[PDB]
Structures are given as C-alpha cells and as structure tokens.
Design an enzyme around this catalytic site. Structure first.
Site, mmCIF file in Angstrom:
data_model
loop_
_atom_site.group_PDB
_atom_site.id
_atom_site.type_symbol
_atom_site.label_atom_id
_atom_site.label_comp_id
_atom_site.label_asym_id
_atom_site.label_seq_id
_atom_site.Cartn_x
_atom_site.Cartn_y
_atom_site.Cartn_z
ATOM 1 N N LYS A 31 37.466 -43.329 -91.988
ATOM 2 C CA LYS A 31 37.794 -44.665 -92.471
ATOM 3 C C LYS A 31 38.984 -44.559 -93.406
ATOM 4 O O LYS A 31 38.902 -43.896 -94.441
ATOM 5 C CB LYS A 31 36.602 -45.273 -93.211
ATOM 6 C CG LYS A 31 36.579 -46.798 -93.234
ATOM 7 C CD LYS A 31 35.876 -47.322 -94.477
ATOM 8 C CE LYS A 31 35.348 -48.722 -94.273
ATOM 9 N NZ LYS A 31 34.011 -48.662 -93.625
ATOM 10 N N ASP A 39 25.138 -56.778 -95.764
ATOM 11 C CA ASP A 39 25.841 -57.209 -94.567
ATOM 12 C C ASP A 39 25.218 -56.591 -93.328
ATOM 13 O O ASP A 39 25.863 -55.813 -92.631
ATOM 14 C CB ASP A 39 27.321 -56.831 -94.655
ATOM 15 C CG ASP A 39 28.214 -57.760 -93.852
ATOM 16 O OD1 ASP A 39 29.368 -57.388 -93.574
ATOM 17 O OD2 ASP A 39 27.765 -58.865 -93.501
HETATM 18 C C1 LIG Z 1 33.547 -46.536 -81.912
HETATM 19 C C2 LIG Z 1 32.036 -46.533 -82.118
HETATM 20 C C3 LIG Z 1 31.593 -47.788 -82.861
HETATM 21 C C4 LIG Z 1 31.320 -46.435 -80.776
HETATM 22 N N1 LIG Z 1 31.669 -45.365 -82.928
HETATM 23 C C5 LIG Z 1 31.859 -45.378 -84.240
HETATM 24 N N2 LIG Z 1 31.564 -44.379 -85.080
HETATM 25 C C6 LIG Z 1 31.858 -44.658 -86.364
HETATM 26 N N3 LIG Z 1 31.633 -43.807 -87.357
HETATM 27 C C7 LIG Z 1 32.433 -45.909 -86.563
HETATM 28 C C8 LIG Z 1 32.854 -46.513 -87.898
HETATM 29 O O1 LIG Z 1 32.731 -45.866 -88.934
HETATM 30 C C9 LIG Z 1 33.426 -47.932 -87.927
HETATM 31 C C10 LIG Z 1 33.740 -48.534 -89.137
HETATM 32 C C11 LIG Z 1 34.259 -49.822 -89.162
HETATM 33 C C12 LIG Z 1 34.492 -50.500 -87.976
HETATM 34 C C13 LIG Z 1 34.196 -49.894 -86.764
HETATM 35 C C14 LIG Z 1 33.667 -48.609 -86.738
HETATM 36 S S1 LIG Z 1 32.535 -46.654 -85.081
#
Ligand SMILES: CC(C)(C)Nc1nc(N)c(C(=O)c2ccccc2)s1
Length: 243
Positions: free
Chosen positions: A27, A103
């Site tokens: 992030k 949330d």
């Molecule tokens: C791309 C997905 C959702 C199948 N796998 C994800 N792994 C993580 N760790 C994600 C996120 O940390 C994140 C944070 C904000 C918005 C979208 C995904 S999203």
C-alpha cells in the site's frame, strides 16, 4: 529482498520477491493505520508485515467478497454462512482488543487462496476500548449503505453495535445479491419498509426464513436492543448445518 512491483491492484501494488518469490501487497490518518496494524494477529485479518510511505500487507489471491456475489442473486447460503462465521471470528477478535474497523463491507473483505476471508484496511479503524474503559464514538465514518442508523442521528454512540450492523448488511448482500437501502434513515423508503416489516419486498423476499430471522435481530434500529456478537453465535441459522 528487493521487491518487483508486478501490477496495481487498487494505492496498492503487487510486490514479488525475486529470491524467494513470496508475494505481498504493497500500500503506497496513516500513523494510526500502522499503529493499529502493529497490534493485529488473526487468521481472519489481513497480515501486516511492516513498513518503510510503504505498507507491507498479506496479499490475498482469492480476490474480494464482492467478486463472490452474483448481482441480484447472492451466493449459496452455505458459502454465506462460512463467510459470516469467519467475519464474526475476525470482528470478535478486533473488538476483543479494543479495535473497531468502522468500514466493514465486501470491498474490505478479502479472500486468500483457501478462500479464507480477511478483514482489510484499518485506515478508518479506531480504538474504542483502552485500559478496560469504553470510549463512545462521535465521529462519522464508513459507507452509507453499511452504516448503522444511530451514527446518522446521534452525537455519540457505541462502537460494537455499529460493526455488527454493517456485518448484517453484508450478510444481506451475500444472500440477496443487493443492498437493502441507500442509507439507514427514515427519509429512505426502503428502510422505512423494513422497519415496517414489509419482508415480502426485496431484498428480504429472496432470503430464507432462518437467516432472515437473524437479520431481524441484527438490523435493529436501537443499538441497545440490537443483537450482540455472543448472541449471534447462538442464533439458529448461525448454528445450522449447511452443505
Ligand atoms: C487484488 C486482490 C484484492 C485480489 N488481492 C489483494 N490483496 C491485497 N493485499 C489487497 C489490498 O491490500 C488492497 C487495498 C486497497 C484496495 C484494494 C486492495 S488486494
């Protein structure tokens, strides 16, 4: 330990380690997010590995809960139950250590490879218990369809029932494939209809009587009358064996 950024996922990217190849989500208000992430250790919460601003988070290759839901239909009641048990497990835990997510919605419920649900994004999360003393919440946070009604009409409120409400709205979304109202206010027809028990309308009509009896207990307007998590754990549909 020099991570390749494969692609964007949302501002989050997918990082893969060349040497070991373990995938992680990166992030790219925040001091609290890291603060809170540091406290968490649960199998139903997205894992925090560290930081440098860059946050190293457990990557969930399963996707998000919304992907699992067919619009206007939802999903097989058995999958919904399994997801709800895990949702409850995570929320019990967070509450157990004085943290409210604030949330909760399918966008923030991520699925790993085994399909285990993980609560994601503690950006809006706050402490509601510290040194065994509850602090009522006065701030407004969240997303209108999942928010508890008391948050819209009260100066201060308890954190826990707010998370419980949103979990009910999520259960609705898993079983009906649609969200009941725009917001939980009397100015909203759909919500007035539910408070009036017009369950012959949508989404409630798409929902078996047993899970719907549980939503009658969760989507209760008065947060003191609203069911608590220990009592959800004793509910008939919750403990109903499903294949
Ligand atoms: C791309 C997905 C959702 C199948 N796998 C994800 N792994 C993580 N760790 C994600 C996120 O940390 C994140 C944070 C904000 C918005 C979208 C995904 S999203």
């Amino acid at each position: 330990e020099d991570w390749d950024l494969v692609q964007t996922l949302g501002e989050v990217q997918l990082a893969v380690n060349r040497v070991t190849e373990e995938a992680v989500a990166v992030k790219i208000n925040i001091k609290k997010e890291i603060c809170i992430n540091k406290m968490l250790n649960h199998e139903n919460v997205v894992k925090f590995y560290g930081h440098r601003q860059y946050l190293f988070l457990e990557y969930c290759s399963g996707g998000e809960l919304f992907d699992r839901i067919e619009p206007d239909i939802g999903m097989p009641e058995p999958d919904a139950q399994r997801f709800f048990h895990q949702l409850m497990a995570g929320v019990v835990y967070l509450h157990g250590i004085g943290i409210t997510h604030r949330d909760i919605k399918p966008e923030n419920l991520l699925l790993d490879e085994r399909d285990n649900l993980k609560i994601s994004d503690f950006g809006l999360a706050t402490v509601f218990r510290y040194n065994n003393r509850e602090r009522l919440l006065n701030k407004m946070c969240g997303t209108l369809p999942y928010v508890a009604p008391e948050l819209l009409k009260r100066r201060e409120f308890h954190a826990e029932p707010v998370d419980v409400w949103s979990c009910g709205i999520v259960l609705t979304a898993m079983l009906a494939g649609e969200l009941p109202w725009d917001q939980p206010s009397d100015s909203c027809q759909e919500y007035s209809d539910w408070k009036e028990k017009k369950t012959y309308l949508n989404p409630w009509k798409k929902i078996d009587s047993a899970p719907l009896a549980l939503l009658h207990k969760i989507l209760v307007e008065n947060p003191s009358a609203r069911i608590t998590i220990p009592d959800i754990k004793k509910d008939r549909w919750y403990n109903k064996p499903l294949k």
